């Protein structure tokens, strides 16, 4: 198919994320290749090379077509593509479970593989519900979070997404009614934690778990946060006997400057979800980890098992590439790499603070954000960034980047320059 034909098929037949059919203001751009930090896109019938400043929605931490990950895929493909995980086990699943147990916050000793972030969140909730049921406390069935969060698109996951961001107002009666604390502030305020505790106290007997994104809230608004809040959550949860679940699907694997965002506080949750960057952005894969205590209590419960099992559970191909991606990250000085990326984002984005339409500039590890005083028009921002050799996709009022870890200092400066120019145009209406 030519790029023209691809566009024709797409407009007529393909849904896109959170999109319409036939009512798109901006046509999608045809991608024809991806290598390292670079995408080959079609612009006016001509292929142009642009920086993947988004890491393809936070996935491509090592860039595209990395030799180590390509080779991991083809070497597994040669021996075993997939086998059912019902009654069978295999080396890729075992290697990956061993790695994940050994690098995640202490105490996370068991691993449930699934195929997506949203599914891993449902699995986490199921673990929490079956746990309390295993303790003879089935009243503990509700979830508590703070506002500003995002946890995926399946119906249980939706129920803990920010009620404003997730337009819950049109899911009246269908969504489970969960407990929401106010938006967690950037700076540490003991008063916020005390109020969080006071609210949790009113619901403790009906709460299975607190579920939050640690340190960085991604899709909900790129808000950062103080890690000390996570210390308070762990204390509150311990004292009131509510499970703590960390959703690290966004973040995990070095993105925030620590290996996992929980590490910024030294906090272990009871259950943890990982996903986006798990395979280095090659293949869909997610994981839900829980403590030995949670696993044993579930296993000793009425069901005698966790009542979940996806078709492609622990897929050998996805597990093999993930093994390679995790080893590639751990086999280098990733901490210094992320610190350098963060330095580059900070230096490059400082000039945006002076721009008329800019309300905030913030950086946390390999995440850089320009917050604007108005929603960013994609019809202007997209071509503007492409003209500067960078693929950016703002959402709401945010011009942001989460670049691949392999981006050179020069490439980071190219990214921040494009971000600044988009922010300048926003004020130019």
Ligand X SMILES: *Cc1c(COP(=O)(O)O)cnc(C)c1O
Ligand Y SMILES: O=C(Nc1ccc2snnc2c1)N1CCN(c2ccccc2)CC1
Catalytically annotated residues: 18, 150, 247, 276
Please give the annotated binding residues, written as ranges: 57, 117-118, 150, 247, 276, 309-311, 393
Identify the residue whose tokens are 């089935």: 138
Q: Based on CB atoms, which residue is closest to ligand Y, 117 or 368?
A: 117
Helix, strand or coil, per DSSP, at residue 174: coil
Q: Based on CB atoms, which residue is closest to its own copies, 29 or 347?
A: 29
First to last CA, the chain: 37
**Closest residue (Cβ) to ligand X?**
117
Q: Show the beta-strand stretches assigned E in 115-163.
A: 142-146
190-205 burial: b if 16+ Cβ within 10 Å, else e: eebbeebbeebeeeee
Which tokens in the block code for residue 379? Answer: 């019809």
Residue 111's closest CA among 89, 93, 135?
93
Element containing residue 111 per DSSP (H, E) = strand 108-114
Should residue 182 be labelled a site residue for ligand Y when binding is judged by CB under 6 A?
no
> 399 and 392 in contact (C-beta within 8 Å)?
yes
Q: Based on CB atoms, which residue is closest to ligand Y, 57 or 188?
A: 57
Q: Based on CB atoms, which residue is closest to ligand Y, 166 or 365?
A: 166
Q: Which does 343 bind (CB under 5 to 8 A by kind): ligand Y, ligand X, its own copies, none?
A: none
What minimum distance in Å lies between the beta carbon of 353 and ligand Y?
Answer: 26
What minimum distance in Å lies between the beta carbon of 286 and ligand X?
Answer: 6
| Residues binding ligand X (CB under 6 A) | 116-118, 121, 150-152, 213, 218-219, 247, 249-250, 275-276, 310-311
Should residue 174 be labelled a site residue for its own copies when binding is judged by CB under 8 A?
yes
Q: Which does 220 bind (CB under 5 to 8 A by kind): ligand X, ligand Y, its own copies, none?
A: ligand Y
Q: Based on CB atoms, which residue is closest to ligand Y, 217 or 414?
A: 217
Alpha helices per DSSP H over 135-182: 155-158
Rule CB under 6 A: which of 226-285 touch ligand Y? none
Identify the residue whose tokens are 């049921």: 133
- How far CA 356 is from CA of 75, 147, 217, 360, in Å, comes to 53, 28, 26, 11
> 382 and 393 in contact (C-beta within 8 Å)?
yes
Residue 235's closest CA among 182, 295, 194, 186?
194
Rule CB under 6 A: which of 43-62 touch ligand Y? 57
What minimum distance in Å lies between the beta carbon of 255 and its own copies?
Answer: 14
What minimum distance in Å lies between the beta carbon of 306 and its own copies?
Answer: 6
Should residue 402 be labelled a site residue for its own copies when binding is judged by CB under 8 A?
no
What minimum distance in Å lies between the beta carbon of 10 and its own copies?
Answer: 5
Q: What is the 3-state secondary structure (H, E, C) of 267-310?
A: CCCCEEEECCCCCCCCCCCEEEEEEHHHHHHHHCCCCCCCCCCC
**Torsion angles phi and psi, residue 421, rounded to 5:** -65, -35
**Could you say which of 63, 220, 316, 365 contacts ligand Y (CB under 6 A)?**
220
What minimum distance in Å lies between the beta carbon of 330 and ligand Y?
Answer: 27
Please give the annotated binding residues for S-adenosyl-L-methionine, written as ranges: 57, 150, 309, 393
**Could you say which of 107, 310, 383, 389 contacts its own copies (CB under 8 A)?**
310
Q: Which does 165 bind (CB under 5 to 8 A by kind): ligand X, its own copies, ligand Y, none?
A: ligand Y
Please give the annotated binding residues for substrate, written as ranges: 276
Which tokens in the block code for residue 298? Answer: 């579930």
> 128 and 245 in contact (C-beta within 8 Å)?
yes
Should residue 323 be labelled a site residue for its own copies when binding is judged by CB under 8 A?
no
What minimum distance in Å lies between the beta carbon of 143 and ligand X?
Answer: 14
Should residue 195 be labelled a site residue for its own copies when binding is judged by CB under 8 A?
no
Should residue 378 be labelled a site residue for ligand Y when binding is judged by CB under 6 A?
no
Should residue 84 be labelled a site residue for ligand Y when binding is judged by CB under 6 A?
yes
**Could you say which of 128, 161, 286, 320 contacts ligand Y (CB under 6 A)?**
161
Cα distance between residue 153 and residue 3, in whole Å: 30
Please give the annotated binding residues for pyridoxal 5'-phosphate, written as ranges: 117-118, 247, 310-311
Cα distance between residue 199 and residue 250, in whole Å: 27
DSSP 336: H
Q: Which does 329 bind (CB under 5 to 8 A by kind): ligand Y, its own copies, ligand X, none?
A: none
> 256 and 365 in contact (C-beta within 8 Å)?
yes
Chain residues binding ligand Y by CB under 6 A are 17-18, 57, 84-86, 150, 161-162, 165-166, 219-220, 309, 311, 313
């Amino acid at each position: 198919l030519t790029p023209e034909q691809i566009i024709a098929v797409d407009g007529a037949h393909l849904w896109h994320p959170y999109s319409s059919i036939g009512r798109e203001a901006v046509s999608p751009v045809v991608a024809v290749a991806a290598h390292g930090a670079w995408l080959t896109l079609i612009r006016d019938g001509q292929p142009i090379e642009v920086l993947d400043a988004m890491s393809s929605w936070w996935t491509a931490i090592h860039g595209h077509g990395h030799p180590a990950l390509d080779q991991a895929l083809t070497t597994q493909l040669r021996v075993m593509n997939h086998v059912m995980f019902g009654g069978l086990t295999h080396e890729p699943a075992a290697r990956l479970a061993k790695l994940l147990v050994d690098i995640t916050p202490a105490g996370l000793d068991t691993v449930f593989f699934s195929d997506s972030g949203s599914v891993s969140v449902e699995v986490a909730a199921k673990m929490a519900l079956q746990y309390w049921r295993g303790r003879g406390l089935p009243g503990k069935r509700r979830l508590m979070t703070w506002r500003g969060g995002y946890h995926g698109d399946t119906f249980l996951a939706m129920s803990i997404c920010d009620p404003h961001g997730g337009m819950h107002s049109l899911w009246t009666d269908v969504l489970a009614a969960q407990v929401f604390a106010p938006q967690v502030p950037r700076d540490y305020d003991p008063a916020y934690s005390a109020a969080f505790e006071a609210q949790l106290a009113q619901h403790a007997g009906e709460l299975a778990a607190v579920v939050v994104e640690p340190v960085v809230q991604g899709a909900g608004g790129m808000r950062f946060h103080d890690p000390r809040y996570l210390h308070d959550l762990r204390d509150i949860c311990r004292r009131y006997e509510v499970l703590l679940i960390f959703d690290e699907i966004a973040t995990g694997f070095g993105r925030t400057g620590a290996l996992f965002a929980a590490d910024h506080a030294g906090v272990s949750p009871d259950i943890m979800c990982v996903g986006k960057a798990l395979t280095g952005g090659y293949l869909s894969l997610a994981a839900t980890l829980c403590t030995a205590d949670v696993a044993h209590t579930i296993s000793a419960g009425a069901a005698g098992a966790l009542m979940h099992g996806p078709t492609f559970m622990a897929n050998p191909l996805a597990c093999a590439v993930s093994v390679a991606s995790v080893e590639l990250l751990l086999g280098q000085d990733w901490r210094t790499r992320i610190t350098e990326l963060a330095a580059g984002l900070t230096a490059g984005l400082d000039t945006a603070r002076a721009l008329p339409a800019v309300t905030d500039v913030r950086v946390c590890g390999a995440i850089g954000v320009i917050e604007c005083d108005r929603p960013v028009d994609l019809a202007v921002a997209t071509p503007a960034a492409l003209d500067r050799g960078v693929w950016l996709r703002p959402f709401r009022n945010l011009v942001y980047a989460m670049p691949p870890y392999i981006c050179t200092p020069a490439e980071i400066t190219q990214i921040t320059s494009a971000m600044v120019e988009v922010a300048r145009l926003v004020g130019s209406l």
